[PDB]
Amino acid sequence: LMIAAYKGHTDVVRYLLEQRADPNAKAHCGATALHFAAEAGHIDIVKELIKWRAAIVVNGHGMTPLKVAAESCKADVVELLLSHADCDRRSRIEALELLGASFANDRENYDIIKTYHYLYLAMLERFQDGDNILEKEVLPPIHAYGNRTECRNPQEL
């Protein structure tokens, strides 16, 4: 199931899940058969597993399958995992921010306009309620990335 989710053969994994396989199949690295699908951007396989209710659990590296999907720049699976109706807000802000970050620097996916627009959407969604403002906790500035201190405001973004 895990390799079939990683590979593009959606027929094989759909047949395996239709044959009453294990949806919560833990791996040695903690990837529960959703990260393999949500690493190669296979939207249909993720759709099939969500239909079979594969469930979302943090892997060994402290990452959700949504986190891996955001890391691999694959936006469509990020959307599908956000539409799972059990996600809360903080996961949505961090997932959109991670998607913008991954789009900022990658080999296959490099579109800086996507990074700016996704970070803008993350900031606007973050500053949506007006009151109860979800201010970003910021690590102290690191000399490697210049000396910037993120963008705590939409104006500086």
Binding site: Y6, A27, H28, C29, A31, E39
Partner: peptide, 21 residues
């Protein structure tokens, strides 16, 4: 050659992906 890092596959080879995994 250049400086382009061939590590984008290495970030994805940590999952058990092979003929056997």
């Amino acid at each position: 050659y250049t400086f382009f890092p061939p590590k984008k596959s290495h970030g994805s080879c940590a999952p058990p992906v092979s003929r056997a995994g």
